[PDB]
Amino acid sequence: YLPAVFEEVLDLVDAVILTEKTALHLRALQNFRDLRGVLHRTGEEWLVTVQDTEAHVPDVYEEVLGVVPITTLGPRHYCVILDPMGPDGKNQLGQKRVVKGEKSFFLQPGERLERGIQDVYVLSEQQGLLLKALQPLEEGESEEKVSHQAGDCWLIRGPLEYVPSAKVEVVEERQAIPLDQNEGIYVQDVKTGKVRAVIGSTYMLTQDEVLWEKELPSGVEELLNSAPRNKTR
Amino acid sequence: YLPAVFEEVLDLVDAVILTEKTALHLRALQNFRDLRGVLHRTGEEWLVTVQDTEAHVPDVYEEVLGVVPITTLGPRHYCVILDPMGPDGKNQLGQKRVVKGEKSFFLQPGERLERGIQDVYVLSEQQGLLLKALQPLEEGESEEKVSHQAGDCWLIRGPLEYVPSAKVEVVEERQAIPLDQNEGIYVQDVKTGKVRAVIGSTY
């Protein structure tokens, strides 16, 4: 290209190589039309992938911010996207989506993850997850398909795979209670305060139950005759 | 070749010798057509083997990354390929395939192995493998052909050969319990906590 007399050359522009693992983040410096014919007003941000071109050329009306890697969710990996895209095409500020099921996508502009590619909760028949329904009475969208009020607690158990829904928060992992005959733990139903001792087979604390403290007045050394005894046992 | 006046010589290019044990990894610097007539857009990566040519010539539109050795799986060797090829021809990012049965292949671009040419689990009548079904209820694709829920545990035993499926993980190798008459171990069924003493034959 011979630079015309009325033209002056600044520098050469290199088209960033667009792979299946990379995307180009661009913002418009002015109202214009890109190479593929997409309206881009000033301040708008968009993504360019291999579906558009194999190597997009940075334009004078396009400002490059960086390269967006494809966040790949594995078969047991989930993620919570903050400030997502709505169907209108804007940041849904203040909300969050949950994505799972072997998905691979590029981070749309103005998005960031809660933790980032979390491991999906897998729990056996001897594991449990305590949950709190922090939002107004989700009847569906849960494994149980049962409404949970705004604030209460419940336990999910069984050899299944759980993922934190967009309206629930995990509290703790219920485990570590193996029980034998004539052996047990003191449990207190915090809802109504009915302290009781479960004896026999392995028992897991219900949503409203918790371990209870049993005190023996000056009787520990008599019945125990190094390590401190489990008072909840 | 007499270099033409309008041409200028850079250097000579040597065709990499393609053997049955080697493959050429290439990426396109621009949209072009290779020697054999294959469309190659910018950024695409492909492999060239003896099936294509005995010695492929690095082109100006082709960038050489390295040589891909043929990962040979022995008769008792398996492997778990991360980010495999789907039928469409792209990296299946986040998934994994299991390959066994005396297979020999070249690593497709954008692939790497979990451990690499693992020894296939062979267990006798006195050996066992504890497994956890970490994915949703595989009815088939297992030796037992029985569904296992998402998280529970089960034991596989017998003089067979096992390979970790693409949906299961191995936990431990059950062994070291030889028992004689009036001899035994105290065992606890953790599911229900029924502690009991097994006595007599090996258990």
UniProtKB/Swiss-Prot annotation, chain A:
Source species, domain of life: Eukaryota
Residue(s) carrying Phosphoserine: S218
Coiled coil: none
Post-translational modification: Phosphorylated on Tyr residues after EGF stimulation.
Signal peptide: none
MVP repeat ranges, renumbered to this chain: 15-69, 70-120, 121-176, 177-233
Subcellular location(s) per record: Cytoplasm; Nucleus
Record remark: domains: MVP 3 mediates interaction with PTEN.
Subunit structure: The vault ribonucleoprotein particle is a huge (400 A x 670 A) cage structure of 12.9 MDa. It consists of a dimer of half-vaults, with each half-vault comprising 39 identical major vault protein (MVP) chains, PARP4 and one or more vault RNAs (vRNAs). Interacts with TEP1. Interacts with PTEN and activated MAPK1. The phosphorylated protein interacts with the SH2 domains of PTPN11 and SRC. Interacts with APEX1. May interact with ZNF540.
General function of this protein: Required for normal vault structure. Vaults are multi-subunit structures that may act as scaffolds for proteins involved in signal transduction. Vaults may also play a role in nucleo-cytoplasmic transport. Down-regulates IFNG-mediated STAT1 signaling and subsequent activation of JAK. Down-regulates SRC activity and signaling through MAP kinases.
Protein name: Major vault protein
Annotated source species: Rattus norvegicus (Rat)
